[PDB]
């Protein structure tokens, strides 16, 4: 029955001075105790063929590592005590496989660390005792701070023994602050030989593609993910002359690409599903649209629209509604001005608690104008202009929490962010730059960035500081003549596309070095 190396009882057993766990236990034995055993390590997948255990304990042993799934084969296990040993590290999934565990004690073995979510998989837990360990409080203990507040199980208080700046401090008392475990970087991945004016992304049949407008070949370039090597490859082209903006619009699982050209341009294309080739559908009126500088896509109350900015005095900036078979003229705006950019944003306008669709378009040598959507007349009215800001090339918007901000691009002088107040934009941050043709906010994995491009100088990447409530200098990219910046998201992968007017286009990887 019981091996003579270890003391036993009818319903109980106590083992001491053994280098290996006995292979066989009598069927009625339940609880097992190992004291000062010569174990080098726990056996991988140990405690097989001993299902009856309701309790187990180890004391005063020497364990360098406790392997994953060491406790599998114990469906009836409830109390687990591992304490008063010397242990350096244990694996995360060691406790995995026991959902019946009730009480657990890691106390007083002088553990300096624990792997994240070691306690995942035990949903029956009530009491846990970590006391007595020397706990270095760092990124490795951040998950444990998250776990202390979210667990219903009672846990006696434990203290930080390190780093010495935090000493005898309760791990329970810590909060989301006082932790910086994450930094971010943009590293160059691919270099595209062609120069580009604009880059855009779209999702067709749950597949995220990229459209790049190359001005000097007139081509509208399409890039698709390739799993075998680097994902970006060129799958298709649309041919045009002097293509400026290429805007894909997917409507009810049907792809439309609006491409603006400077030579007899402004054509609307659709993707034919069977042939999987782009087919010219409509031609935008050449008298209304002449020198388009921009295209903005937006959807309001289950209706799709797009608007083209005309920088010619003769042409008019025009919004095009979708009747379901195609795009047709809806409203002309800002007659006899030179329109460089159009921007759509939904902002709360006091008194209204609801957000309302708005337009912001930038006229050359003029102040930016804001249009409020009127639901009753289905038109933009109440033209209002951003005060004390002139020669704005473009306006882009981002939101932090509930508030919304805008990045205004001024080619000369300061380009500055502004926050939407009740009736107005208040000045927030002022950064001067030379030759800035783009100021682009980007949000990647809840990280707000602002990239400020420059021709004569370096492109300056900024990060949003929640505590400072302003953008902070972050990184400096080198790109020849940035006209645009686009965030591309593959599955769990993220990229940054940087257009270059006078040079080759840049593709940057989004790299996160992170610990817990």
């Amino acid at each position: 029955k019981c091996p003579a190396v270890c003391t036993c009882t009818k319903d109980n057993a106590l083992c001491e001075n053994a280098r290996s766990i006995p292979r066989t236990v009598p069927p009625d034995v339940i609880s097992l105790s190992f004291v000062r055993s010569g174990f080098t390590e726990i056996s991988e997948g140990s405690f097989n063929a001993t299902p009856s255990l309701q309790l187990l304990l180890f004391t005063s042993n020497s364990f360098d590592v406790i392997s994953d799934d060491a406790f599998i084969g114990l469906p009836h296990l409830e109390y687990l005590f591992i304490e008063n040993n010397n242990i350096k590290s244990i694996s995360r999934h060691t406790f995995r496989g026991l959902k019946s565990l009730i009480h657990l004690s890691l106390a007083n073995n002088n553990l300096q660390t624990l792997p994240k979510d070691i306690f995942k998989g035990l949903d029956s837990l009530t009491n846990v005792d970590l006391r007595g360990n020397s706990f270095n409080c760092d990124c490795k203990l951040k998950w444990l701070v998250e776990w202390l507040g979210h667990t219903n199980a009672t846990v006696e208080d434990i203290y930080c023994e390190g780093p010495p700046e935090y000493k005898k401090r309760k791990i329970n008392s810590l909060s989301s602050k006082d932790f910086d475990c994450i930094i971010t970087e943009f590293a160059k991945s691919q270099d595209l030989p062609y120069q580009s004016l604009s880059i855009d992304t779209f999702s067709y049949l749950n597949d995220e593609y990229v459209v790049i407008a190359q001005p000097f070949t007139g081509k509208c370039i399409f890039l698709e993910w390739d799993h075998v090597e680097k994902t970006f490859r060129n799958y298709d082209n649309i041919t045009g002359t002097s293509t400026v903006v290429c805007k894909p619009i997917v409507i009810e699982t049907q792809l439309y690409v609006i491409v603006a050209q400077l030579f007899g341009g402004s054509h609307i294309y659709k993707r034919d599903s069977f042939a999987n080739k782009f087919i010219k559908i409509q031609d935008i009126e050449i008298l209304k649209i002449r020198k388009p500088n921009d295209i903005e896509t937006f959807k309001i109350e289950n209706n799709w629209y797009f608007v083209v900015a005309d920088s010619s005095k003769a042409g008019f900036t025009t919004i095009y509604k979708w009747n379901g078979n195609g795009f047709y003229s809806h409203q002309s705006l800002h007659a006899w001005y030179r329109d460089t950019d159009v921007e759509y944003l939904e902002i709360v306008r006091t008194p209204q608690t609801l957000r309302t669709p708005h337009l912001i378009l930038s006229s050359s040598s003029q102040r930016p104008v804001i249009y409020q959507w009127n639901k009753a007349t289905q038109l933009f009215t109440n033209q209002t202009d951003i005060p004390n800001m002139e020669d704005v090339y473009a306006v882009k918007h981002f939101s932090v929490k509930g508030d919304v901000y805008i990045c205004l691009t001024r080619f000369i002088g300061d380009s500055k962010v502004m926050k939407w107040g009740g009736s107005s934009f208040q000045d927030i941050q002022r950064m001067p730059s030379q030759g800035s043709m783009v100021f682009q906010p980007l949000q990647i994995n809840n990280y707000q960035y602002a990239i400020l491009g420059s021709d004569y100088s370096f492109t300056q990447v900024y990060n949003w500081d929640a505590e400072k409530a302003k953008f902070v200098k972050f990184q400096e990219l080198n790109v020849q003549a940035p006209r645009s910046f686009t965030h591309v998201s593959i599955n769990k992968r993220n990229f940054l596309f940087a257009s270059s007017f006078k040079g080759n286009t840049q593709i940057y990887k989004h790299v996160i070095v992170d610990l817990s």
Binding site: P215, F216, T241, S242, L262, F263, R290, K291, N293, D310, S311, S312, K313, A314, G315, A335, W336, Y337, R338, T340, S364, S365, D391
Partner: protein, 484 residues
Amino acid sequence: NVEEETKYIELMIVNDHLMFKKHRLSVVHTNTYAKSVVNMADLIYKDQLKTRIVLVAMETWATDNKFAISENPLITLREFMKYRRDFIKEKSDAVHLFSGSQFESSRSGAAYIGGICSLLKGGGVNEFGKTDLMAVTLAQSLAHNIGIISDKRKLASGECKCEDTWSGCIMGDTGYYLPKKFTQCNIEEYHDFLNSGGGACLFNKPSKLLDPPECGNGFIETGEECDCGTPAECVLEGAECCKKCTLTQDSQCSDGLCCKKCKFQPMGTVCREAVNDCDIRETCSGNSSQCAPNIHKMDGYSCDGVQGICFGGRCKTRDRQCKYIWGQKVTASDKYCYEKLNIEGTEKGNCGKDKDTWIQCNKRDVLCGYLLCTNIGNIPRLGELDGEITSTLVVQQGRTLNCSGGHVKLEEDVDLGYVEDGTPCGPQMMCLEHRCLPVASFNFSTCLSSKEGTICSGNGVCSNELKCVCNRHWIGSDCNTYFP
């Protein structure tokens, strides 16, 4: 050759009150801004048209506008030229207005076509923009003054096309990307304007400039004995003559049309030959390095033989008017077509228009009525066609003659398609107000002549200055003294 010669546009800029406010009511900021705009426009004209834009004077209004400014650029142009006629006394080839207001119109400016060096038509109107945009706006307005037109007919044909696809040419619609280059057809139109007798003034070289005088700029200024220009330009001509704008003691002639080997060309040497029937050959004074002021025959001289009369150095005929509006393939209709169609007073021909009424052309005055051209295309060269072209055929002496016309409007106030004033309907008769009137009626001034029944005694020709230009071997006030 007139095309080879360098042409100089003396330009005066008038800044309205809104332009002054845009510059924060600073005289230095306004003057430096305008100077920058004119300098860039000068770069374009120097590169393309072999023409230099010189700023002779500038008038800025610190107080409120003298005349009410208008949203319509054509209306503002009329008021501005009205003001500049009655008020501005400064000498300039062209007077352009910089307006802080933005005109509501397809145009960013308005300028009279071929109006250069007219006191009434010599001006232009330009809306406020950035320095580069203002330079292009000034370039296209001055282009209209020097006779550069859109020429819609050849554009629709495709023969005339700006070969820059990304950015247009100057005369086209201006987007965010600005044009620096003129079309070749624009060049040909400018040269045709020069060859027809337009812009004679442009050949005068500016003596005084608004900017403080600098040596080596190519223009002589008070206190400057000579200017040969840039050292390379100096090496080409006038290197030995002129150094540091100081005449070398040996040689008082540095660089000029009448200047050769650093010595004055003898009197009577011909610097520039006449470009047409109306032009008069200029000759070297012998007292000046520059050639004599460009002059032309006085109004009323016969051009193209019998068919035409000279006005402003330019020949006015119905044929040239037809070829102007409807293109070079057109020719003037036969006189019978005028005679039969105009007397009818219908849409097909008339002496004029009244509200809800058509004016029957009087029997006496016909060739002064509705303009009829043999072969007419659908699209006019300039202006916009109103209505549809009118076509009527008449047969005289067993041969059918096709005679057509159209209503073409440059602006709402002035309507083309009617015979221009001054056309010779009949011998000693000029077309005026759709009527043939004896030349004596308006009493053209003539140059002095000793002999009766001759001009300038018969030894000379009358000029734009009303002075006799004598034939070789004849000299005098009246050209009546024999001096071989």
